[PDB]
Design a binder for this molecule. Structure first.
Ligand SMILES: CSc1nc(O)c(Cc2cccs2)[nH]1
Length: 248
């Protein structure tokens, strides 16, 4: 039987006193039905593995990432070495392409939900807020507010309904911004927000943009586009110069 070593954040670390294997246990006491459902579909090296669950309080058995959250690899006001950021961003796109390929949107992509394993491989974690946006090759627009404000796409704040995919692309851009600058550009993406207004006006001589080399910044120019139809898609991110620029 598993022993709960410590609280990971509730999630606690469980270790098999026999095998000695480690996993992560998520404890929920009265959405959870869907988190499990969705988890059951998932299988990818950039998504936190679902092992199983048991209904005593409901217990979730998730891959343990001994690297912690990406959030804790970002030096405040500084970010991280551009090469580590690019690497994490590649794996983030792989994770996302995958989810999107099987009709699933995470809806809450942020450094707190990107975990690292022992080789610093990046895993998308927590599908508590995820949902299906394609079923039977039929796309459903999303009508519910979700996620965190700094990472949310603007159309979710001003539109009755919106496509799922560009919302995740936007959030990945903010994440890239965070990796490369150690700060978030704005509290939320509304015109009421001075900082978001400045970006729409291309004032890149301000923070965080001035801290970001011009190759990555040009990509951010394509991702952080307000019109979700104008916004770059992932196939096209895969062809961007910085994305493909080799880094030491
Ligand atoms: C996919 S659930 C989950 N797994 C882990 O590992 C966490 C959090 C943390 C792991 C290691 C430091 S925090 N949450």
């Amino acid at each position: 039987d598993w022993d709960l070593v410590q609280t990971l954040g509730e999630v606690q670390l469980a270790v098999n006193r026999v095998t000695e294997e480690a996993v992560a246990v998520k404890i929920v006491d009265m959405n959870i039905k869907k988190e499990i459902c969705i988890n059951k579909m998932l299988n990818h090296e950039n998504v936190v593995k679902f092992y199983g669950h048991r209904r005593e309080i409901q217990y979730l058995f998730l891959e343990y990432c001994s690297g912690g959250e990406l959030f804790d690899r970002i030096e405040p006001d500084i970010g991280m070495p551009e090469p580590d950021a690019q690497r994490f961003f590649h794996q983030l796109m792989a994770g996302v392409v995958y989810l999107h390929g099987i009709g699933i949107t995470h809806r809450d992509i942020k450094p707190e939900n990107l975990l690292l394993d022992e080789r610093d491989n990046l895993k998308i974690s927590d599908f508590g807020l995820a949902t299906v946006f394609r079923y039977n090759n039929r796309e459903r627009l999303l009508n519910k507010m979700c996620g965190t404000l700094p990472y949310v796409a603007p159309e979710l704040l001003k539109r009755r309904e919106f496509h799922a995919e560009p919302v995740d692309v936007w959030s990945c851009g903010i994440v890239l911004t965070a990796m490369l600058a150690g700060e978030l550009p704005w509290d939320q993406p509304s015109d009421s927000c001075q900082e978001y207004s400045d970006w729409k006006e291309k004032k890149t001589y301000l923070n965080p943009w001035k801290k970001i080399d011009s190759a990555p910044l040009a990509l951010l120019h394509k991702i952080l586009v307000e019109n979700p139809s104008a916004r770059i898609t992932i196939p096209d991110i895969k062809k961007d110069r910085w994305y493909n620029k080799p880094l030491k």
